[PDB]
Amino acid sequence: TAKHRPSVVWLHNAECTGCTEAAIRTIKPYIDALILDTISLDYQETIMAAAGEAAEAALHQALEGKDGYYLVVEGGLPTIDGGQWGMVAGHPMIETTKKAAAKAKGIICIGTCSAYGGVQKAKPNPSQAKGVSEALGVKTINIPGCPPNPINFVGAVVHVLTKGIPDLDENGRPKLFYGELVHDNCPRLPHFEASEFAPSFDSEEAKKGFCLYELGCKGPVTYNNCPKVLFNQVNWPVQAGHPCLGCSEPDFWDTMTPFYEQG
Amino acid sequence: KPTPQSTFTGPIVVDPITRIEGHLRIMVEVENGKVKDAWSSSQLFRGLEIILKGRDPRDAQHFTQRACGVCTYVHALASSRCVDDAVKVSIPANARMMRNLVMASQYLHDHLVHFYHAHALDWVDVTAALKADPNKAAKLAASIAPARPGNSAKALKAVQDKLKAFVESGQLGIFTNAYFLGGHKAYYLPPEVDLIATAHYLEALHMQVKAASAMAILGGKNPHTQFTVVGGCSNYQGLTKDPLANYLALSKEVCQFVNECYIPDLLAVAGFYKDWGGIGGTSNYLAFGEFATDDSSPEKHLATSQFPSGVITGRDLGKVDNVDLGAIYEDVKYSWYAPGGDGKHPYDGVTDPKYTKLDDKDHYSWMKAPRYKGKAMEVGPLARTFIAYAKGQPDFKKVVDMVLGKLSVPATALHSTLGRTAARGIETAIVCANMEKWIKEMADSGAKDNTLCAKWEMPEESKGVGLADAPRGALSHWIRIKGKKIDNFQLVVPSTWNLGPRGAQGDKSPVEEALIGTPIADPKRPVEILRTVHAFDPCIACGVH
Numbered sequence A: 001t002a003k004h005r006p007s008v009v010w011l012h013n014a015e016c017t018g019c020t021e022a023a024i025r026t027i028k029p030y031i032d033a034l035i036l037d038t039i040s041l042d043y044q045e046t047i048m049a050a051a052g053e054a055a056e057a058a059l060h061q062a063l064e065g066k067d068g069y070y071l072v073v074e075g076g077l078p079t080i081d082g083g084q085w086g087m088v089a090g091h092p093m094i095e096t097t098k099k100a101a102a103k104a105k106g107i108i109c110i111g112t113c114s115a116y117g118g119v120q121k122a123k124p125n126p127s128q129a130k131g132v133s134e135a136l137g138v139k140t141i142n143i144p145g146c147p148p149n150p151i152n153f154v155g156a157v158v159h160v161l162t163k164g165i166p167d168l169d170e171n172g173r174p175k176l177f178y179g180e181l182v183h184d185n186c187p188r189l190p191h192f193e194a195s196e197f198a199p200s201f202d203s204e205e206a207k208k209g210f211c212l213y214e215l216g217c218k219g220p221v222t223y224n225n226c227p228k229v230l231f232n233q234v235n236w237p238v239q240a241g242h243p244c245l246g247c248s249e250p251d252f253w254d255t256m257t258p259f260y261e262q263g
Numbered sequence B: 001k002p003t004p005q006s007t008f009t010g011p012i013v014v015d016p017i018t019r020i021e022g023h024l025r026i027m028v029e030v031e032n033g034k035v036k037d038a039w040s041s042s043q044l045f046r047g048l049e050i051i052l053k054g055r056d057p058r059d060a061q062h063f064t065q066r067a068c069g070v071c072t073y074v075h076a077l078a079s080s081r082c083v084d085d086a087v088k089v090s091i092p093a094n095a096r097m098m099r100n101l102v103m104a105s106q107y108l109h110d111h112l113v114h115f116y117h118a119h120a121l122d123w124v125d126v127t128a129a130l131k132a133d134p135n136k137a138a139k140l141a142a143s144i145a146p147a148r149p150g151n152s153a154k155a156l157k158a159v160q161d162k163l164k165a166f167v168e169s170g171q172l173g174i175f176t177n178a179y180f181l182g183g184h185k186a187y188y189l190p191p192e193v194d195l196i197a198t199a200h201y202l203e204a205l206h207m208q209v210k211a212a213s214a215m216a217i218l219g220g221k222n223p224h225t226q227f228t229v230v231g232g233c234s235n236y237q238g239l240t241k242d243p244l245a246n247y248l249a250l251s252k253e254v255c256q257f258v259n260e261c262y263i264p265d266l267l268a269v270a271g272f273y274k275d276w277g278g279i280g281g282t283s284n285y286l287a288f289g290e291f292a293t294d295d296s297s298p299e300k301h302l303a304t305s306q307f308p309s310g311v312i313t314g315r316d317l318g319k320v321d322n323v324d325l326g327a328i329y330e331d332v333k334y335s336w337y338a339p340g341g342d343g344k345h346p347y348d349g350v351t352d353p354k355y356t357k358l359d360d361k362d363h364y365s366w367m368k369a370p371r372y373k374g375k376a377m378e379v380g381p382l383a384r385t386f387i388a389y390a391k392g393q394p395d396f397k398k399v400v401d402m403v404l405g406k407l408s409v410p411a412t413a414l415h416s417t418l419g420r421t422a423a424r425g426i427e428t429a430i431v432c433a434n435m436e437k438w439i440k441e442m443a444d445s446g447a448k449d450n451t452l453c454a455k456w457e458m459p460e461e462s463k464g465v466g467l468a469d470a471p472r473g474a475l476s477h478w479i480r481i482k483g484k485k486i487d488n489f490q491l492v493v494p495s496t497w498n499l500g501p502r503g504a505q506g507d508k509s510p511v512e513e514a515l516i517g518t519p520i521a522d523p524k525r526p527v528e529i530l531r532t533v534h535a536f537d538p539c540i541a542c543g544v545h
């Protein structure tokens, strides 16, 4: 029988691989079911068997597939010195991503780095790292956060494959996951409203679970679904007593710092 | 019984090295089927040390954690230890306990995924699993591991059927162009062992979700934890009964998988590849230790780490030397940095990027070359294992001897790619054996004391160092504070030690040395290069930062 699951090519540029790691924390479905039954994951450096020229051949076979493919991009694009500070198989990352983007059925940027540039773009940006859209002038479906919840990434992939392009906000993020502020769903909101704040991490107020706004919490300016869905089915940063860093916002490394202040 | 080896003479380049973190190009020269020279060429620079200059020292841990999301947490921990040292704060006992448990959880998650999802495909021919008799495989599994339903013939057959449907679909996905397709002389396992390992590879994808959920009870989330602050931790809930009960339950499930699947699979694989106990060795080992009972200073960390610190040189297990933090430096001679940067202790670190060209053997990596008293040092599970074994650490003596007896090999056989792989499993079993004790310690401490963050003040000018032994080895972060801001922040990371380039004297790094003598059965499918490189568990985002 002639069979085909939609081809996904996943590229790693200037990244920490935390987005790949987040993706494999999915439980609806688990990652094995996704790659056995739903997609054909045709290039993925972190987990693929082929290496070297065999891996590069697998990439080319996927990019030339007659059925087309979806492109997932993890990491920013380092552009300084002709793109040479980030290379795979002797090719600048920006060159390979440009080529893959040009024929992709759709482009999903997993993480703040591919969506907006991320940690390596933070001032003074030694490698002149750029987000994918910033570098290439192409529209992308952005699944940001550092890393995003697998619920948001796998949810977006499944949506793209079964329903179409989900409604995106002005930062390219699906409203399904990014339509609400972290703060608006935070269980510490009743403390915030009552101006009940922890003045320090050692304080009795912190022990009592008071709001973390005075300690820098960016929940009020950050669009994500963290308190609603949790991470790892168990926790999220504020529940663990720590302020939100704003990690799903563009350029947060520069716009949300200092992290323990309200700048 | 001879190790397969071609007569190939010529160059081999493997780029990308897949099934590692980050971007690595390996070049080797081969003569008569054995590697005679090697280069470890890291292919991405980000420049986190540069980015940190002038920033708030409190922010460092959030940036440096993004050095890597495979070894998530560990850089937040090293940065936190570093700033704690710089501000001269001693964290409360509960914060030491919580930080060290989150490290333990990370070791379990990271080593399980490494063995199955990164390394196993170098030893296991997945397609050969389709040829196995599942009843024979179940009988074998019953002889080499505890009884478990996932090892039943019915369960193994269900795995075979899934894999058969996938292979016959025409879309091989992550197995496209695998080195084992069509058969490969360097792959030794019986089909039944391939099937058992492949079944466990799939189970491990589910079990690593549980290992990450355990870690997140204390860490806030995984990847990229968010529970550490200057002076300790923020997670008061993680000191309490129900969360710690759930953390114990999840950790027990994970450890059951370590003991039932990881260790028996590792020993089965090792038994068939005993020749690999004579390939891939190095001679010098460094650890800063981890799981300390006193983390009030870097010196106390070194002295009181339950996985002890130390230095071994020349394979001499009769002597372990104390770590001198003043003796660490990094070279850049063979790296993509400006001339003039050799011999820098990390408090005097300089990160001045200067690219030349691909395969310039005078400058071939974005990693610096860390050296210790003039020598390259291997770091990671094998370093920790030899240091602990040499010192008579009782858990390492027990578990190492178990493995030596099962395989009928001496401790010296561990100076090898097989040994490096075995050590990773050994220490995973030992972390498992200690989880209940460490959890009870923190549960009893958290029940009587909710001090989790100490008070502190930012100094105008100071310096400090944070040490950790992360899953890949000796990690250190080094800060100079001036004007209450970061004046210099230098990371020296385990994959920097293991996979950096040559040092100022032209001396090969541990992976470059380990690659000398590698046999190559088929130069078009050089799985033997991957076996050794993967055994070091490389992380290039870590190594370069």
Ligand SMILES: *S(=O)(=O)N1CCOCC1
Pocket (backbone or CB within 6 Å): A220, A221, A262
């Ligand atoms: S803060 O600037 O006080 N914060 C309050 C409410 O929403 C966003 C900003």
Ligand code: SF4
Pocket (backbone or CB within 6 Å): A014, A015, A016, A017, A018, A019, A074, A075, A110, A111, A112, A113, A114, A118, A119, A145, A146, A147, A148, B066, B069, B224
């Ligand atoms: S978005 Fe964050 S977690 Fe993902 S690759 Fe970038 S630094 Fe890593």
Ligand code: SF4
Pocket (backbone or CB within 6 Å): A182, A183, A184, A186, A187, A188, A189, A190, A192, A210, A211, A212, A213, A217, A218, A219, A220, A238, A243, A244
């Ligand atoms: S802790 Fe943060 S997200 Fe929660 S109520 Fe306070 S400011 Fe909002």
Ligand code: FCO
Pocket (backbone or CB within 6 Å): B068, B071, B074, B075, B470, B471, B472, B473, B475, B493, B494, B495, B496, B538, B539, B542, B543
């Ligand atoms: N373990 C780990 Fe990552 C590396 N190398 C760090 O530190």
Ligand code: F3S
Pocket (backbone or CB within 6 Å): A145, A146, A182, A222, A224, A226, A236, A237, A238, A243, A244, A245, A246, A247, A248
């Ligand atoms: S730091 Fe990021 S993971 Fe959620 S809680 Fe804040 S958006």
Ligand SMILES: [Mg+2]
Pocket (backbone or CB within 6 Å): B049, B368, B490, B491, B492, B493, B544, B545
């Ligand atoms: Mg460094």
Ligand SMILES: [S]
Pocket (backbone or CB within 6 Å): A004, A005, A006, A007, A040, A065, A067, A068
């Ligand atoms: S495809």
